[PDB]
């Protein structure tokens, strides 16, 4: 199958932008925790997304990235992107 990001991959990028260079661990069901509820700013969200984007080869526009209220959506986007990438 296409190599999709796991929740560990997602979480790693997530944690590091979440605060002061690794700020919020998100060890638990972070997909069910909305960014607003985890003290997340969408700038950190952009920073997180762009890292994954540039590292694995996906494209998530500003309007779309700053519109993924839940982390499962970010991985959903990357799922649809990476699985359809060769």
Curated annotation (Swiss-Prot):
Record keywords, A-Z: Antibiotic biosynthesis, Phosphopantetheine, Phosphoprotein
GO molecular function term, any single one: acyl carrier activity
Pathway annotation: Antibiotic biosynthesis; actinorhodin biosynthesis
InterPro entries for this protein: ACP-like_sf, PP-bd_ACP, Ppantetheine_attach_site
GO biological process terms on file: antibiotic biosynthetic process; lipid A biosynthetic process
Functional note: Acyl carrier protein.
Protein name: Actinorhodin polyketide synthase acyl carrier protein
Lineage: Bacteria, Bacillati, Actinomycetota, Actinomycetes, Kitasatosporales
């Amino acid at each position: 199958m296409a190599t999709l990001l796991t929740t560990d991959d997602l979480r790693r990028a997530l944690v590091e932008s979440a605060g002061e260079t690794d700020g919020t661990d998100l060890s638990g069901d972070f997909l069910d925790l909305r960014f607003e509820d985890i003290g997340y700013d969408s700038l950190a969200l952009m920073e997180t997304a762009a890292r994954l984007e540039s590292r694995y080869g996906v494209s998530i526009p500003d309007d779309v990235a700053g519109r993924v209220d839940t982390p499962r959506e970010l991985l959903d986007l990357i799922n649809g992107a990476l699985a359809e990438a060769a």
